[PDB]
Design a protein around this motif. Structure first.
Motif, PDB file in Angstrom:
ATOM      1  N   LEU A  45       0.812  -1.212   0.000  1.00  0.00           N
ATOM      2  CA  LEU A  45       0.000   0.000   0.000  1.00  0.00           C
ATOM      3  C   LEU A  45       0.849   1.267   0.000  1.00  0.00           C
ATOM      4  N   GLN A  46       2.135   1.109   0.306  1.00  0.00           N
ATOM      5  CA  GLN A  46       3.068   2.231   0.342  1.00  0.00           C
ATOM      6  C   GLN A  46       3.831   2.427  -0.977  1.00  0.00           C
ATOM      7  N   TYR A  47       3.536   1.601  -1.973  1.00  0.00           N
ATOM      8  CA  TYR A  47       4.288   1.634  -3.223  1.00  0.00           C
ATOM      9  C   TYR A  47       3.397   1.797  -4.437  1.00  0.00           C
ATOM     10  N   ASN A  48       3.922   2.489  -5.445  1.00  0.00           N
ATOM     11  CA  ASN A  48       3.463   2.325  -6.819  1.00  0.00           C
ATOM     12  C   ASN A  48       4.697   2.266  -7.718  1.00  0.00           C
ATOM     13  N   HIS A  49       4.487   2.053  -9.014  1.00  0.00           N
ATOM     14  CA  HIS A  49       5.591   1.726  -9.907  1.00  0.00           C
ATOM     15  C   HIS A  49       6.594   2.869 -10.085  1.00  0.00           C
ATOM     16  N   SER A  50       6.169   4.102  -9.826  1.00  0.00           N
ATOM     17  CA  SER A  50       7.018   5.250 -10.142  1.00  0.00           C
ATOM     18  C   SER A  50       7.367   6.138  -8.954  1.00  0.00           C
ATOM     19  N   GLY A  51       6.835   5.819  -7.782  1.00  0.00           N
ATOM     20  CA  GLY A  51       7.053   6.649  -6.611  1.00  0.00           C
ATOM     21  C   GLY A  51       6.240   7.932  -6.665  1.00  0.00           C
ATOM     22  N   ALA A  52       5.271   7.971  -7.574  1.00  0.00           N
ATOM     23  CA  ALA A  52       4.364   9.103  -7.685  1.00  0.00           C
ATOM     24  C   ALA A  52       3.405   9.150  -6.501  1.00  0.00           C
ATOM     25  N   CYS A  53       2.678  10.259  -6.380  1.00  0.00           N
ATOM     26  CA  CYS A  53       1.689  10.447  -5.316  1.00  0.00           C
ATOM     27  C   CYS A  53       2.272  10.217  -3.927  1.00  0.00           C
TER      28      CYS A  53
END
Length: 107
Positions: A45-53
């Motif tokens: 929940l602390q991650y997405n693919h690009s470090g966005a948001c």
DNA sequence: TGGCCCCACGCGGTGC
DNA sequence: GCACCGCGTGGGGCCA
């Protein structure tokens, strides 16, 4: 006989066969390659693919590996199904397509 | 069912 | 202004 701990091509083929789509395949590979993010702690929940948001960025190395499987293994594994169920019926449709729709011939 | 899973989609933020 | 980008959200399929 290679190491049983490596992610083998066979397993990857099995995951392709299990996936519902290429995107779903990518998601399943995400779970397979980031198990530490998919424990009950749900670090995912602390991650997405690009470090966005304002989030952490997924390891680009493993992301790269996922991409590699999407381009090298997924299409080869899905070729027959794609050909048989999408391409062939499209070809037939193009062959039998009427120059005028019936609903537009009547009116 | 109801729990798990998938994906579509309106939304606000961003950048050119 | 408007394309582009991930979020939060909910419709809905699958199955024991």
């Amino acid at each position: 006989v290679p190491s049983p701990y490596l992610l083998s091509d066979k397993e990857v083929r099995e995951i392709v066969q299990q996936s519902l789509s290429v995107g779903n395949f990518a998601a399943r590979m995400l779970v397979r390659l980031f198990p530490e993010l998919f424990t009950t702690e749900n670090l995912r929940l602390q991650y997405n693919h690009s470090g966005a948001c304002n989030k952490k960025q997924l390891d680009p190395t493993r992301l790269r590996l996922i991409r590699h499987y999407v381009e090298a293994v997924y299409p080869v594994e899905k070729m027959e199904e794609v050909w048989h169920y999408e391409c062939i019926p499209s070809i037939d449709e193009r062959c039998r397509r009427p120059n005028r729709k019936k609903c537009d011939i009547l009116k």
